[PDB]
Ligand binder design. Structure first.
Ligand SMILES: Nc1ccn([C@@H]2O[C@H](COP(=O)(O)OP(=O)(O)OP(=O)(O)O)[C@@H](O)[C@H]2O)c(=O)n1
Length: 367
RNA sequence: GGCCAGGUAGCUCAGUUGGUAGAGCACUGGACUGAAAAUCCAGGUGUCGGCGGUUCGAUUCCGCCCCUGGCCACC
């Protein structure tokens, strides 16, 4: 219908950006980005009006948002910078060749992929490539983004792009960049499943030293990240119904050796979840003594009392120890699973004394 | 869209080792009155957002959502 209204309005609209990428990558998304030649706002308003749904105009930006079913649509008037602007100009201001492409929704040429910079080739050759040498200088944030993409799509930075990247970091542009955009980029990063590879790229191009103050790379942290990867794999395999956000764990491992001040400040800037802050504050201090108590554990009920109050994250951090692994697992798929019939419980009940009694019964069952 | 609070009576507000809920003014009924108010005895002041899950038991632990306010990312 978009091509039809665009025909009636004598306009030209296109699907543009990552949305194209994902389409060519077979990944179906519900957020579609349109670049319109001519007014995008009226097109959005008309389309929303025909489907009888609400519309959200942004005249100053020149964009409009509307939601149809589970489809989220964003229309944006073609602009040369971040006289009417051609599509090509809207695309050439973009970052990488794979994000620079477009697909025509106009009825005559419909289905056509419009690629000026050969983003199809770089998509085919698995290459992350900037459009212009100044691309990282324009937006230093891209430095992260590239790596992130290279992490997710398992692509490789071209020689050019790699050099320009390293140069961009060497100029310390990462410090000059807005803190918020960078922090948000990292937040996007840790949500990836391939985020570990992205961390490998972060170590390789040493961006974390620039973004995080006081952060340095060592081997213990890396091995901890791979062990955490294995634990995450197993937990997300058998316990997958219990899954939580995994990337934050890696983030905790990274900042583990950092000072509590810089750690708290970083987690503050990252707008981390409460359980992340709790698991961190618990890791920095009480974790050691907890481990030492887990070493002194003999009966199963002590392990119960020491574990059950803790979150899942803390337990996953406890699986990092070779000696504690099988113990944690035993607590997981066996120890905490048990119940009691009717008559027995009815005899148990005959305040808090009921709880203490039930605890005595559980420690009577375990040991 | 991310996060942080806030969600407790009609309104304005506190509450952690899960274990049988509170204040100031409106609400009913009666004692009191020619009627009413005040006042006394008292007692509703509540599935402590909604829905699942864990637990013998959840305002509390967790997950998914609703509402309001504030920091932002809003290519
Ligand atoms: N500094 C920047 C930032 C963004 N862009 C372009 O603007 C778009 C921003 O949308 P985004 O969601 O970041 O791209 P996606 O590929 O959709 O990423 P994702 O799907 O992971 O959101 C990108 O496609 C990119 O081509 C750019 O050219 N330069």
């Amino acid at each position: 219908m978009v091509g039809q209204i665009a025909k009636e309005m004598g306009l030209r609209a296109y699907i543009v950006g990552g949305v194209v990428r994902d389409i060519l990558l077979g990944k179906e998304v519900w957020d579609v980005d349109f670049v319109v030649e001519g007014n995008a706002i009226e097109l959005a308003k008309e389309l929303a009006r025909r489907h009888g749904v609400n519309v959200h105009p942004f005249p100053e930006f020149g964009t409009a948002h509307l939601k149809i079913g589970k489809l989220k649509l964003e229309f944006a008037t073609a602009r040369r910078e971040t006289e009417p602007a051609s599509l090509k100009e809207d695309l050439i201001r973009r970052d990488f060749t794979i994000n620079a492409m477009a697909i025509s929704v106009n009825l005559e040429d419909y289905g056509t992929l419009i690629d000026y910079f050969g983003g199809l080739r770089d998509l085919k050759d698995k290459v992350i490539r900037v459009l212009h040498p100044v691309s990282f200088i324009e937006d230093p944030v891209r430095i992260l983004r590239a790596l992130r993409f290279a992490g997710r799509l398992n692509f490789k930075l071209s020689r050019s792009t790699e050099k320009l990247l390293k140069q961009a970091v060497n100029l310390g542009l990462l410090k000059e960049a807005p803190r918020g955009r960078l922090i948000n980029e990292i937040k996007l990063a840790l949500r990836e499943d391939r985020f570990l590879e992205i961390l490998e790229l972060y170590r390789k191009y040493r961006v974390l030293e620039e973004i995080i103050e006081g952060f340095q790379w060592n081997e213990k942290v890396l091995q901890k990240l791979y062990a955490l990867r294995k634990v995450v794999d197993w937990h997300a395999l058998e316990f997958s119904e219990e899954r939580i956000d995994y990337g934050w764990l890696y983030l905790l491992i990274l900042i583990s050796n950092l000072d509590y001040e810089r750690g708290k400040h970083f987690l503050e800037e990252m707008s981390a979840p409460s359980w992340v802050r709790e698991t961190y504050k618990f890791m920095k201090f009480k974790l050691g003594s907890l481990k030492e108590e887990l070493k002194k554990a003999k009966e199963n009920y002590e392990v119960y009392r020491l574990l059950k109050p803790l979150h899942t994250s803390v337990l996953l951090l406890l699986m990092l120890e070779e000696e504690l692994k099988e113990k944690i697992k035993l607590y997981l798929e066996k120890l905490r699973k048990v119940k009691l019939p009717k008559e027995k419980i009815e005899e148990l009940k005959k305040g808090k004394e009921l709880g203490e009694r039930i605890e005595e019964l559980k420690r009577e069952i375990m040991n």
